[PDB]
Amino acid sequence: DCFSKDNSHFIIDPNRTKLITTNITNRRPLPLSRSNLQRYYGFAETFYYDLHIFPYVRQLVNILETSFNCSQRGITLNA
Amino acid sequence: EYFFSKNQIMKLNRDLQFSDLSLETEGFSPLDLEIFTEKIFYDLQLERDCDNVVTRELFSKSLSAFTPSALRGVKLTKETNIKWGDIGALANAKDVLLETLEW
């Protein structure tokens, strides 16, 4: 109510006393190949497999990707 | 055939006909056949990108690896599979033995 412009950008200041907790929202987590997210915050990095040389890993990752991709086809694959 | 129809619509479109794999799948229960067909259906996203799995005898690849709920425990007898062609020169006996078996 301080301003009519609300969406494009706003500043919180900790001198202002409010928060909200609308349970949960759902959003996709970023792919490693673009984000590399772990190495920025320096956690115990997962081993970066390659997609070729451990062929069963390619098998499993494709098996899961089946169901990301089939979401556009609407079939629930139950993989 | 009923199970293939009960999956989301797909077809055996190539000139293969069901009796081929039926003769290829003697030792199976109905539940096993439901599972085996689901394993075939997963081709639709594991290997093909097509919305329909034209089958191209892919069964010959997967049915070698899948197994029924029968055939459990490590027990074998037909493993050597050398056939009657691999006779040990039973020239005076293979005749009567195979005759007495076959008649």
Contact B70, B28 (CB under 8 A): yes
Query: Contacts of residue A75 in chain B, CB cutoff 8 Å?
Result: 8
Cβ of A73 within 8 Å of Cβ of B42? The answer is no
Contact A76, A69 (CB under 8 A): no
User: Least CA distance to B42: which residue of chain A?
Assistant: A77
A4 DSSP 8-state letter: S
- Nearest by CB to residue B46, choosing from A66, A73, A75, is A66
Q: According to DSSP H, which parts of chain B are helical?
A: 2-6, 19-24, 30-41, 43-46, 59-62, 94-102
Q: How far apart are CA B64 and CA B36, in angstroms?
A: 11
Contacts of A66 (CB under 8 A, 6+ apart): A77, A79, B42, B45, B46
Written as six digits, the tokens of A43 are: 């956690």
Q: How was this structure determined?
A: cryo-EM
Nearest to B35 by CA among B63, B56, B14: B63
Reduced DSSP (H G I as helix, E B as strand, rest coil) percent helix, strand, coil of chain A, to 5 = 35, 0, 65
Stated in angstroms to one decimal place, the resolution of this structure is 4.7
Contact B2, B33 (CB under 8 A): no
Q: How far apart are CA B103 and CA B95, in angstroms?
A: 12
Contact B51, B44 (CB under 8 A): yes
